């Protein structure tokens, strides 16, 4: 049965008794009374969400013995705890409860929640929970996801999640947390702490068994140090972007001070205050694949260690203030992409990009770099490099497929500049160069598909 | 946020912390002849950012006046009132008297 968004004031009594799934979302129900609802004891999916239901009968839901999922979400149940003691009754078979958007409160939540051994996923997000005490989450031994995002949570006692030995997903996004002094959720798998005010993150020291966390989200926080993650071997994804880290523990605004990353895969140190990389910092990030470092004010980036970052598939580094860069031979061997634009490079060794065994994409826009241009490089962008003369042997043995040289006033193309690009180039753009005549034989380029010679 | 409460307790919120300086005991300087010291104090304590909703319980609306009164983006704990301090220090051979500004702090807000 689907009666959603019909504006019904009361519960309808004409529904067949054999109903297994009922939908009433978006109506004007203001109370869930026991008599209309007890007729349909065969319900397994009841949907009352997005109503104005304010009062709940104590024996309202006790008849629906075969409920598997109920959703009272986005209701006015905050005042129910005061209008009614007991609130929800025991729900012996309910598996998914969603009370989100109710403006529920800690303490009021401690009494509203009734015991449910079959609950699989509870959601309380978009509420007004300020703190989690020791006796908030009690008597849910089968919960494995708890959603709390967009709350005002500030304080969390040491053993708030003690009664949840099977919680695996914990979403604490957009909360008012400031300092994390401990972390010992052994079996937790996902932890999201984004859009918080966290100035310091410390984990537990020397646990009995390795933690199961594989997802940390510290983006858009106020961290000042790279967190100590020596006790988190299986952390795979790690956002630390949009923070204040200066590589390269204390909380100065608070005054609190009390193979580490072998299997980390996705590191994101973008938008930080990093100015230099100590050598030991990059030695730990073995088997790290995709490393982003853009919008950092770093001024020098070197990798001299043999085998360092062996499987680094991508290296995003754009929009720094670089003056120099050094790449060791047979070091970034598996490097397929390199973002380098937005910098201020002036001089480089002739084989600075040649030693990259499998480089394919290379953006070097807005840098003022003059051409040695790699059997594997595919896409190139020397846009806004203030170039004047392009020598003939620019791409003799570099089968490039895409090449951009736009916005280079005063460009003088030498004869035979596109030496070996006849069979490999596919799309070429020279917009805004202000060229007077073309010195490159276009018809000889069989594989060209699109051309841009505007302006 | 009483000054006495902030100065005679330990909380993890923006409060004025008690401090007395002695030119000889604390600063280790002796060229300032007068006075023996002053209560400079300082401001310390984080101000969390409060992510907001359209529907909130009536009693979480009091957290805004305490934590982000100005609806800033990254609130900071800063002094709100300051007082001057006169000293007497020797610069060479001529004694000098000056009324230094922004030296004594009484209360701190989140700004």
């Amino acid at each position, epitope marked *: 049965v689907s009666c959603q968004v019909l504006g019904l004031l009361q519960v309808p009594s004409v529904l067949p008794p054999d109903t297994e799934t009922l939908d009433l979302s978006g109506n004007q129900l203001r109370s869930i009374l026991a008599s209309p609802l007890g007729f349909y004891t065969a319900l397994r999916h009841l949907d009352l969400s997005t109503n104005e239901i304010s009062f709940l009968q104590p024996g309202a839901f006790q008849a629906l013995t075969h409920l598997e999922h109920l959703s009272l979400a986005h209701n006015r149940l905050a005042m129910a705890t005061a209008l009614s003691a007991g609130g929800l009754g025991p729900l012996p078979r309910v598996t998914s409860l969603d009370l989100s958007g109710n403006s529920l409160y800690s303490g009021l939540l401690e009494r509203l929640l009734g015991e449910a051994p079959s609950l699989h996923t509870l959601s309380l997000a978009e509420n007004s929970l300020t703190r989690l005490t020791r006796h908030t989450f009690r008597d849910m031994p089968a919960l494995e996801q708890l959603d709390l995002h967009s709350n005002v949570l500030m304080d969390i006692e040491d053993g708030a999640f003690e009664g949840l030995p099977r919680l695996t997903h914990l979403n604490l996004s957009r909360n008012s947390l400031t300092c994390i002094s401990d972390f010992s959720l052994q079996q937790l798998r996902v932890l999201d702490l984004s859009c918080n005010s966290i100035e310091a993150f410390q984990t537990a020291s020397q646990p009995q068994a390795e933690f199961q966390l594989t997802w940390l989200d510290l983006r858009e926080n106020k961290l000042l140090h790279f967190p100590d993650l020596a006790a988190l071997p299986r952390l795979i994804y790690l956002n630390l972007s949009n923070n204040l880290i200066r590589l390269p523990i204390h909380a100065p605004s608070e005054g609190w001070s009390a193979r580490p990353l072998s299997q980390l895969l996705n590191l994101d140190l973008s938008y930080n205050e990093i100015e230099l990389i100590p050598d030991s910092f990059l030695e730990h990030l073995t088997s790290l694949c995709f490393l982003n470092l853009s919008r950092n004010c770093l001024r020098t980036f070197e990798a001299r260690r043999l085998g360092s970052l062996p499987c680094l598939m991508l290296l995003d580094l754009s929009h720094n203030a670089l003056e120099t860069l050094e790449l060791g031979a047979r070091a970034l061997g598996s490097l397929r992409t390199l973002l380098l634009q937005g910098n201020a490079l002036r001089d480089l060794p002739p084989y600075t990009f040649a030693n990259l065994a499998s480089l394919q994409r290379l953006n070097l826009q807005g840098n003022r770099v003059s051409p040695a241009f790699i059997t594997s490089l595919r896409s190139l962008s020397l846009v806004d490099n203030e170039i004047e003369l392009l020598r003939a042997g620019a791409f003799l043995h570099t089968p490039l497929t895409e090449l951009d040289l736009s916005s280079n006033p005063g460009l003088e193309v030498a004869t035979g500049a596109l030496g070996g690009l006849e069979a490999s180039l596919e799309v070429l753009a020279l917009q805004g160069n202000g060229l007077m005549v073309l010195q490159v034989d276009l018809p000889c380029f069989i594989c060209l598909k699109r051309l841009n010679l505007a302006e | 946020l009483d000054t006495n409460y902030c100065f*005679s307790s330990t909380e993890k919120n923006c409060c004025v912390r008690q401090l007395y300086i002695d030119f000889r005991k604390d600063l280790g300087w002796k060229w300032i002849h007068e006075p023996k010291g002053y209560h400079a104090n300082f401001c310390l304590g984080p101000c969390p950012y409060i992510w907001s909703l359209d529907t909130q319980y009536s009693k979480v609306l009091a957290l805004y006046n305490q934590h982000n009164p100005g609806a800033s983006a990254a609130p900071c704990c800063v002094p709100q009132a300051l007082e001057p301090l006169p000293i007497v220090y020797y610069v060479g051979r001529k004694p000098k008297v000056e009324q230094l500004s922004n030296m004594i702090v009484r209360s701190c807000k989140c700004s």
Partner: antibody
Amino acid sequence: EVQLVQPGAELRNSGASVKVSCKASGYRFTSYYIDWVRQAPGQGLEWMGRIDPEDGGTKYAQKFQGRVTFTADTSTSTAYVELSSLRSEDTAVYYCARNEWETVVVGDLMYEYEYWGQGTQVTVSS
Amino acid sequence: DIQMTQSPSSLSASLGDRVTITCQASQSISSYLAWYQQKPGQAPNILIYGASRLKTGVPSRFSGSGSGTSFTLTISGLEAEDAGTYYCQQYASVPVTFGQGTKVELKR
């Protein structure tokens, strides 16, 4: 640690008004509730209502409807009571409690008390 | 208004004995109770939180039990410091109501 102090109320002639003070220290005054419990030597312990210093919301029991009003003053971190039209069946020790968590946590429900005052004896004898 | 009664008006016992005070509620209470330990001259002191959750810093000889309608306080070994009046409280309805008080004294 936090402690609330009340001074002994000596004696008050019948038909007058009494003032019970509950100066508090060691915590942020405008963050908690204040409860007023009365121990008459006749029967048990009776709970009058509670006040919220931050807002000023007043609630009170079924018997003290209009016969008592309590205010707060956030500048000096003190809470008060105003008992009017005294009778003989009023002499009691008036305590002062705190719900132990916060106003935010204890939204509209009721809790127990962990911090008590010392009480005042409002005695009427003429 | 949830009227509650303390079954013994007053009781006298001796050192190293087991003391019991019961509490009966007019209606259902769930687990929202509290026990107090007033001295002969001072203010009340909280003993038991919830219905059996012992506080911190108070002697563990006291134990809580029961739920809904019947609650009992049991003292393991009576001592001179456990002489006074003991109280009940419920926080499950807008009028918070206390018990009546039971005096505990010694005898030799």
